[PDB]
Amino acid sequence: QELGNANFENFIGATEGFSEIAYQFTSHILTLGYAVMLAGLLYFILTIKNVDKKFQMSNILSAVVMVSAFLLLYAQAQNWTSSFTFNEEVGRYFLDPSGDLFNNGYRYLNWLIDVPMLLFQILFVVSLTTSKFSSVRNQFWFSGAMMIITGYIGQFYEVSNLTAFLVWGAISSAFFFHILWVMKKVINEGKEGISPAGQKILSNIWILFLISWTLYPGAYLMPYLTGVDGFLYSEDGVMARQLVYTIADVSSKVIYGVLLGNLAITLSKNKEL
Amino acid sequence: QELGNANFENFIGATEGFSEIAYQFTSHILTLGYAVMLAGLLYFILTIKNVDKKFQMSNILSAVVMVSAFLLLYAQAQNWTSSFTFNEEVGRYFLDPSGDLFNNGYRYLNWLIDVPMLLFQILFVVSLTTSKFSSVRNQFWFSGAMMIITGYIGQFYEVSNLTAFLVWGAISSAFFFHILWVMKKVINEGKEGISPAGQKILSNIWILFLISWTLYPGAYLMPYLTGVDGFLYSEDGVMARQLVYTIADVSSKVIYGVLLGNLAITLSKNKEL
Amino acid sequence: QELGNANFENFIGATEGFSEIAYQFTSHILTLGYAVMLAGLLYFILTIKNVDKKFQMSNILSAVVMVSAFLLLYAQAQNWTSSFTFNEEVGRYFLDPSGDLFNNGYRYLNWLIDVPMLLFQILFVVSLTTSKFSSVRNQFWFSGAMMIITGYIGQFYEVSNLTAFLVWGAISSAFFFHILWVMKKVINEGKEGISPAGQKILSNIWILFLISWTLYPGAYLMPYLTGVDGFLYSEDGVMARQLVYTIADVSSKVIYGVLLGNLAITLSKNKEL
Amino acid sequence: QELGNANFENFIGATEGFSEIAYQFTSHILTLGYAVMLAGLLYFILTIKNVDKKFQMSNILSAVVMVSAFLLLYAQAQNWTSSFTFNEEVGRYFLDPSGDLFNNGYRYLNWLIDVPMLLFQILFVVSLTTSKFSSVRNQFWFSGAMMIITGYIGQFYEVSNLTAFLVWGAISSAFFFHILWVMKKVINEGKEGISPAGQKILSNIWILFLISWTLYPGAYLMPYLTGVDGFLYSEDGVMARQLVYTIADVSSKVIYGVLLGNLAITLSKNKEL
Amino acid sequence: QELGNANFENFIGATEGFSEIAYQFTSHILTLGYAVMLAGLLYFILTIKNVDKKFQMSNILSAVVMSAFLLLYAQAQNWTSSFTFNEEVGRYFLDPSGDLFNNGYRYLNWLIDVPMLLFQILFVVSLTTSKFSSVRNQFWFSGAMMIITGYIGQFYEVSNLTAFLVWGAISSAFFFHILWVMKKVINEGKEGISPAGQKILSNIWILFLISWTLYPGAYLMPYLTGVDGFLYSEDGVMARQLVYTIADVSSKVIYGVLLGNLAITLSKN
Ligand SMILES: *C/C=C(C)/C=C/C=C(C)/C=C/C1=C(C)CCCC1(C)C
Ligand SMILES: *C/C=C(C)/C=C/C=C(C)/C=C/C1=C(C)CCCC1(C)C
Ligand SMILES: *C/C=C(C)/C=C/C=C(C)/C=C/C1=C(C)CCCC1(C)C
Ligand SMILES: *C/C=C(C)/C=C/C=C(C)/C=C/C1=C(C)CCCC1(C)C
Ligand SMILES: *C/C=C(C)/C=C/C=C(C)/C=C/C1=C(C)CCCC1(C)C
Ligand code: NA
Ligand code: NA
Ligand code: NA
Ligand code: NA
Ligand code: NA
């Protein structure tokens, strides 16, 4: 049938269908997703006053991101269950058109919140040295936006037009690398002046940042990571994608936020850990 | 098909239908909408005590507006997905009558909250000089109400009666210009007596106000901005409208509120931003 | 069609149906309704500590009422959209039986919360002189209950039995007049001892009270206010009713609560307006 | 129709059906139910600091109970509307199987929270004299549990097996009487040492306790209180049941909690009424 | 019918169906489940400042766990969606359009709960010989593996008894390790502290041991009376969800309460 510019999940769901395990796991992992976010929201709110006032905006922004992430992940969980329906006769879940096609694009647009805020918030914990606050912020926000928008466009074509898929992806990747560049600079400048304990944490933050953010373009490519008609162009690929997103989200948002708060505590004059 | 006094989205949806991208993007952008608002709610609550007590009503009113905006944008997101349903055979989303017709009128009525409050709240940060508090407030609230109500009437006719559409629109525009007038006065009087830092922020606030508020009549006209049977009288026009609304909403509510809070901080005796 | 003891909305919906504007406006105005209430909830919570401790129960009760009002108005909004469904062929919304008949009775029973609390709460701001606190409270609560319950019974018969409609209404009206009586007494005793500023506010409160509360029996009668087979026995009447309710609710609950809080501030030794 | 071990509501709904008034009132009263609970939640949270720290657990437990009650009453409201559907032809609501059968059992199991907590909480306001805290608590909790569980079993048979109905009921009643016994003891010991104002309140609390708690076994029996084929074995009986539950719930939870808080205030060294 | 790798609830629901009592009780007990969790959330938040600042992370983590609400709520809805009344025979049968019922929701949400529940005690007790990071890491790794292996197993609880039991066994191994470490922790926690505190830690260990053990009980539940036994039936379905609910309340709420009580005794102010 005629699906057009639609994510590959829909093509699997429309042809092969999803096994119990495939469908259920995807449902489960998305649910875990939004559960983590709302739990995180509570954590970040409840820990605000555990750091000096100047650092507390970081906590607040963590919270802001959690709200966004919860809402989107919740929506997406529902979208998954609405989009695919059990067929008694063969014992598989198939595309149910009246539920809408499943799209990952929900995620992408909500990054327009998450990415800017996640990048922003570290600038409230670390002091810069050579770099200007406004400069770093602006470069983060611009590169962040362009990364997301270009990617957002790409992913519509992940089946219908492999070329546009890869080209927009490439453009997106460029802006990604810039963000990586700037974050490294920031982290290095942040290390200057501060205790070895704080430096250790920033080291961890950078590792976490690097891995977790890289997962996202991984999820982009996931269906094609074993070439055409590979292992991953299948329900297994579908599962892998949503797993990676969920891991990425938890890491890039919650764990990131926790580490930052820990850093804030070491840099806090009153407070110990 | 007989649609009557209904928004043009429904006419597109009933005849041509919406592509995957058109339907999905509109869904996505509305979702981002309400997500931003709930995130904002948390921000404004959590930052109340970042300014002197006298300023804190501004924070509170920001929060009040966020609640309104969230609820409306959430409803509207749902209305969009209910109103248009996938057709397997042609691969487009078509008007589903049993979901109700899509109307933008939800937005308009909720402005009866937002507009009065957004105008009101600045009067808790800036001091007036030559203008009287109650006078400015009353002119804001009256002109605000009339602007919205006249617009609300107009938009019902955006297809069924181009003339009424444009006339009510024109009347609405008059009240808009008055509001612009008064806000300018307010901004200028607010600048007097206060630090250059604060003056800079009020300058930004005015620009933001001017652009963001102007977008709304833009969205009004959107379908017709390329004349009859133009580019924009189409799913592309539908997309444009909801994008512009979302940008307008984020700008006019969240960013506006942030800047005001920043101003409040500079004007705060204790706090040194 | 066999509807029985049902509100007149259902008879309109079942015979003539509702135009786009009629259906949509009613939907919109009910939505505004509950949006205002949740916004109000936030306001009243966030402003508690803006008055002396002794006054703060008034804020708390405002909040309590908002919760009630939100829940009910939300339910009612949903009930409206569920009860009436678009017919493609004629382009009007008709009674959809599977959604339940629309009833205003939801509102009535929730007044069993709102009315007692709204009457109660003023007694925490004003001092009485000659009257006893418990006496005024008991008279409010008894008369309030009887007013609502008798009205609640009446409105079931607003179509099926004009006689019972008017008789129960009349009985209800009696208790209403008593409440008006007592509130006047309270307002007068409240004015004694206190600044001209406070007296002004109580004057406004009384006007607001008188008008807003009177709207409710107006809504009761609405369908018949232009006699049999009049303008108002129609979708226009339906619209009028729900508009009036929404205006009444906002006025009698939110604005009322705001004014009371303003009064509390003037009567607060520490706090200024 | 084959209904089995089902509540009598379903038998009425399946045979006679429910009139507009019967269906609507039941819907309305259940809605009022959960509305009161959520309002109560807000009240109890907002008033925590109105008593000395030692008393504040009582407030907290009130809040705990409200959350439980809200959730259950909300669910139950939805269950009612899902279980019974309008039939255009005769103008009555009939059992809709696809909505599930209506069961009161939701209520019963949620008492496993409410009852233990309601009994517990008074022990944080009153001082015992002869009786030990842990002893009273344990007897409350055991007797409470057994009361509920035995009742829960009974009510499944309220139609299918009048004998089991009455026997399990009887067993339940035994545990009830014990609870009554212990609460009386507690109330009497609580009166010793404390002001006449406090004693008055505890007297009221005992009356409230006795009446409100007794309503619950009343609701149990309701359908049969006028014998076989009586007034009450009918939609009128259905209405009566849910009314009584709602009155019982408001009384046993909210009003009870309010009185306790009032008592706490009199017993507070810092605070006056 | 063709159900595949699906939980046994679905096989009961598809063949025999569920009586009013079976269906309703399961609905009721799951509802109680999530109600308790939301109530608990409020309790733990409202009691944070009842202990010294250093202990307050334990309260916060209790709150975080009260995850449980969201999952139990979802699961309640899943139950009612998955099984629909048949008027003709008066039983509830599998309704395919609602999805098959899976317990897997629970399992994956443990990936939150278990790590946090294990973690949080380390904010109340002082260790002696053991290192904080060491205990944490062993908890978190063993916790994850326990859940993941179990999660895989339960898919096969009907379709493949062998895989069911094998993955279960592997899971059990990691469980025993967690038990081991928790015991160590409890013992080290007792050292140096008041008799009041020691008493509470004793209770905590008992509660931990019983409540956590219930979970593998629920795993096996359908087969605890052998093939075609009492429990391979709607009665078994009921038993499972009851045990989960008891386990959840115990392992989360009561656990959290006791910990807070311990925190209070150890509090100087
Ligand atoms: C909390 C959400 C976060 C941190 C999202 C991050 C998203 C990215 C780093 C996306 C990167 C992409 C590319 C670099 C290429 C493909 C398109 C994107 C947007 C997925
Ligand atoms: C947060 C919402 C805001 C700030 C809404 C603002 C809305 C307007 C400025 C609407 C203006 C209009 C005209 C000036 C002409 C067409 C009708 C309106 C109401 C869209
Ligand atoms: C917040 C809700 C309020 C203040 C509701 C007030 C309701 C009334 C004053 C109702 C009055 C009525 C009559 C006096 C006659 C008709 C029946 C009633 C109940 C609508
Ligand atoms: C907030 C809920 C409360 C206070 C519930 C109280 C419930 C009872 C006192 C139930 C009593 C029963 C009997 C004594 C006999 C019939 C079975 C019961 C459980 C309804
Ligand atoms: C709050 C949730 C908790 C404490 C969950 C605990 C879960 C377990 C201890 C699960 C244990 C299992 C086995 C040891 C064997 C079968 C598979 C599991 C995961 C159910
Ligand atoms: Na599905
Ligand atoms: Na749709
Ligand atoms: Na509708
Ligand atoms: Na119904
Ligand atoms: Na069902």
SS3 of C11-64:
HHHHHCCECHHHHHHHHHHHHHHHHHHHHHHHHHHHCHHHCCHHHHHHHHHHHH
Q: Supply angle C-alpha E247, E249, E254, rounded to 5.
A: 110
CB-based burial label for E188 (10 Å; 0-12, 13-18, 19+): middle
Residue positions counted in chain D: 273
Q: What is the 3-state secondary structure (H, E, C) of chain C?
A: CCCCCCCHHHHHHHHCCECHHHHHHHHHHHHHHHHHHHHHHHHHHHCHHHCCHHHHHHHHHHHHHHHHHHHHHHHHHHHHHHHEEEECCCCEEEECHHHCCCCCHHHHHHHHHHHHHHHHHHHHCCCCCCCCHHHHHHHHHHHHHHHHHHHHHHHHHCCCCHHHHHHHHHHHHHHHHHHHHHHHHHHHHHHCCCCHHHHHHHHHHHHHHHHHHHHHHHHHHHHHCCCCCCCCCCHHHHHHHHHHHHHHHHHHHHHHHHHHHHHHHHCCCCCCC
What are A118's two structure tokens? Answer: 């996640």
Cross-strand bridge partners of residue A198: none
- Please give the structure tokens belonging to residue C128: 């009485």
> After which residues does chain D become discontinuous at a C–N distance over 2.5 Å?
none
3-state secondary structure of A107: helix
**Which of B73, B146, B153, B216 for mutating ligand 2's site (highest number of atoms within 8 Å of CB)?**
B216
Task: For residues D267 and E2, give the distance between their C-alpha atoms in angstroms, rounded to a whole number.
Answer: 67
Q: Which residue has the tokens 């004057």?
A: C203
Ligand nearest to the CA of C77: 8
In the chain, the amino acid numbered D97 is: P
Angle of CA points C260, C266, C267, to nearest 5° = 85
| Residues C136 and C144: beta-carbon distance below 8 Å | no
Question: Which of A29, A91, A93 is closest, CB to CB, to E3?
Answer: A91
Q: In sequence order, which residues have a C-beta less than 8 Å from that of residue C76 and are 6 or more positions away? A: C30, C33, C34, C104, C106, C107
Residue B265's nearest CA partner among A53, C199, C137 is: A53
Pick from A205, E4, A224, E22: nearest CA to E13: E22
Of B238, B186, B175, nearest to B209 by C-alpha is B186
A31 to chain E, minimum CA–CA distance in Å?
Answer: 8
Cβ-based interface (< 8 Å): residues of D facing E: 1-6, 45, 48, 60, 63-65, 67-68, 71-72, 75, 97-98, 100-101, 103, 105-106, 108-110, 112-113, 156
Indicate whether residue A249 lines ligand 1 (CB < 6 A): yes
What percent of chain D is helix, strand and coil (3-state, nearest 5)? 75, 5, 20
> CB of A40 within 8 A of CB of A254?
yes
Pocket of ligand 1 contains residue A173 by CB under 6 Å: yes
Q: Which residue of A has its CA nearest to B23?
A: A100
CB of D103 closer than 8 Å to CB of E29: no
* Residue E230 DSSP class: T
User: Does residue C199 have its Cβ closer than 6 Å to ligand 3?
Assistant: no
Q: What is the C-alpha to C-alpha distance for residues D182 and E202, in angstroms, rounded to an integer? A: 31
* Residue D118 beta carbon below 6 angstroms from any ligand 4 atom: yes
Min Cα–Cα distance to chain D from E55, Å: 19
Find the angle CA(E70)-CA(E72)-CA(E74) to the nearest 5 degrees.
65
Report angle CA C140, C142, C147 to the nearest 5 degrees.
90
CA distance D81 to B78: 22
In this complex, which of A31, A42, A93 lies closest to E74 when CB atoms are compared?
Answer: A31
Minimum distance, in Å, between the CA of residue E41 and any CA atom of chain A: 10
Tell me which DSSP letter residue A88 carries: T
Shortest CA distance to C30 belongs to which of C114, C115, C102? C102
- Subunits next to A (3 or more Cβ pairs <8 Å) are B, E
User: Is B3 in contact with C91 (Cβ distance < 8 A)?
Assistant: yes
Q: Which atom of ligand 3 is found nearest the CA of C213?
A: 9
CA torsion sign for D213, D30, C29, B256 is positive
Tokens representing residue D42 in the block: 């807000």
Atom in ligand 3 nearest the alpha carbon of residue C107 = 2
Find where tokens 């729900």 sit: C242
Residue A256 Cβ inside 6 Å of ligand 1? The answer reads no
The alpha carbon of residue D84 is apart from the nearest alpha carbon of chain C, in Å, by: 9
Q: Pocket residues for ligand 5 (CB within 6 Å)?
A: E 110, 113-114, 117, 146-147, 150, 153, 168, 171-172, 175, 212, 215-216, 219, 248, 251-252
Q: Is D252 in the pocket of ligand 4 (CB under 6 A)?
A: yes
The contacts of residue E266 (CB under 8 Å, 6+ apart) are E52, E55, E124, E193, E194, E197
The pair of structure tokens assigned to B213 is 């508020």
Residue range E1-269, CATH number: 1.20.1070.10
Helix boundaries (H) for chain B = 8-15, 20-46, 56-83, 105-121, 133-154, 162-191, 196-221, 235-249, 256-266
Give the contacts of E94 (CB within 8 A, at least 6 positions apart). Answer: E1, E10, E13, E14, E82, E83, E100
Contact D48, D59 (CB under 8 A): yes
- Which subunits sit against E, judged by 3+ Cβ pairs under 8 A? A, D
CA distance D257 to D252: 8
For chain E, what's the residue count? Answer: 269
Chains C and E touch (3+ CB pairs under 8 A): no
Residue with tokens 């617009």, as numbered in its chain: B151
User: What's the CA gap between B189 and B183, in Å, rounded?
Assistant: 10
Q: Cβ–Cβ of C24/B72 closer than 8 Å?
A: no
Residue C94 phi, psi (nearest 5) = -120, 155
Q: Which residues contact E255 (CB under 8 A, 6 or more apart)?
A: E117, E204, E207, E208, E211
Instruction: List all residues 6 or more positions away from E217 whose beta carbon is below 8 Å from its beta carbon.
Output: E224, E243
Ligand 7: centre distance to CA B24 (Å): 9
Q: Is C115 in the pocket of ligand 3 (CB under 6 A)?
A: yes
Q: Is the backbone of residue E52 left (phi > 0), alpha (psi -120 to 50) or beta? A: beta
C-alpha D133: how far from chain center: 24
CB atoms near residue D130 (< 10 Å): 8
Give the H or E element holding residue A92.
strand A92-95
List residues of chain D with CB under 8 Å from any CB of chain C.
Answer: 19-21, 23-25, 27-29, 31-32, 34-36, 38-39, 42-43, 46-47, 81, 85-91, 93
Method: X-ray
Find all residues with CB under 8 Å of A181, minimum gap 6, and list them.
none
Q: Do chains E and B touch (3 or more CB pairs under 8 A)?
A: no
User: Is B189 within 8 Å of B128 (Cβ atoms)?
Assistant: yes
Atom of ligand 2 lying closest to residue B173 CA: 14
- Dig out the tokens for D248 from the structure: 């019982």
Q: E32, D3: Cβ pair inside 8 Å? A: no
CB of C172 shorter than 6 A to ligand 3: yes
> For chain B, which chains pass the contact test of at least 3 CB pairs under 8 Å?
A, C
Check if the beta carbon of residue A18 is closer than 8 Å to that of residue A12. yes
Q: Cα dihedral sign for C160, C164, C166, C171?
A: negative
Q: CB of A44 within 8 A of CB of A57?
A: no
List chain A residues with CB under 8 Å of E111: 32
- The dihedral built from the CA positions of residue A251, A253, A258 and A263, taken in this order, carries a sign that is positive
Structure tokens at D239: 């209405």
Interface residue of D45, D54, D71 to substitute, partner E, most E CBs within 10 Å:
D71
- The Cβ-side half-sphere exposure at E7, using a 13 Å CA radius, reads 26
| Residue that has been written with the tokens 């998954």 in this structure | A80
The whole-angstrom separation of Cα D53 and Cα D11 is 51
Is C75 in Cβ contact with D21 (below 8 Å)? no
Helix D56-83 and helix D235-249: axis angle, to 10°? 160
Q: Which ligand is nearest to the CA of D111?
A: 4
**C-alpha torsion D152→D158→D160→D164, nearest 10:** 70
Q: How far off is chain B from C117, nearest CA to CA, in Å?
A: 23
Choose which residue among E106, E215, E252, E255 to substitute to test ligand 5 binding: the one with the highest number of ligand atoms within 8 A of its C-beta: E215
Structure tokens at E196: 């009041």
Residues paired with A243 in a beta bridge: none
Residue B78 CB-density burial (10 A; 0-12 exposed, 13-18 middle, 19+ buried): middle
**Protein residue whose Cα sits closest to atom 20 of ligand 1:** A217
What is the rounded distance in angstroms from the CA atom of residue A155 to the CA atom of residue A108? Answer: 9
Q: Which fold has domain C1-273?
A: Rhopdopsin 7-helix transmembrane proteins (1.20.1070)
Number of inter-chain CB pairs under 8 A, A vs E: 77
Spatial contact of C13 and C83, defined as CB atoms under 8 Å apart: yes
SS (H, E, C) B181-230: HHHHHHHHHHHCCCCHHHHHHHHHHHHHHHHHHHHHHHHHHHHHCCCCCC
Q: Please, which residues have CB within 8 angstroms of residue B73's CB and are 6 or more apart in sequence?
A: B30, B33, B34, B37, B249
The answer to whether the beta carbons of residues C232 and C225 sit under 8 Å apart is: yes
- Contact residues for D124 (Cβ-Cβ < 8 A; gap 6+): D54, D55, D57, D58, D61
Ligand found nearest the CA of D115 = 4
What's the gap in Å between the CA of B9 and the closest CA on chain C? 14
CA distance B40 to B42: 5
Q: D110–E32: do the CB atoms touch at under 8 Å?
A: yes
Residue E213: half-sphere exposure toward Cβ, Cα within 13 Å: 8
Residue type, B263: L
**From ligand 3's centre to the CA of D25, what distance in Å?**
18
| Torsion sign over Cα C252, C255, C261, C266 | negative
- State the residue for tokens 């969201």: E70
DSSP bridge pairs for A86: A93
Contact partners for chain C, using 3 or more CB pairs closer than 8 A, are B, D
Ligand at shortest distance from the CA of A83: 6
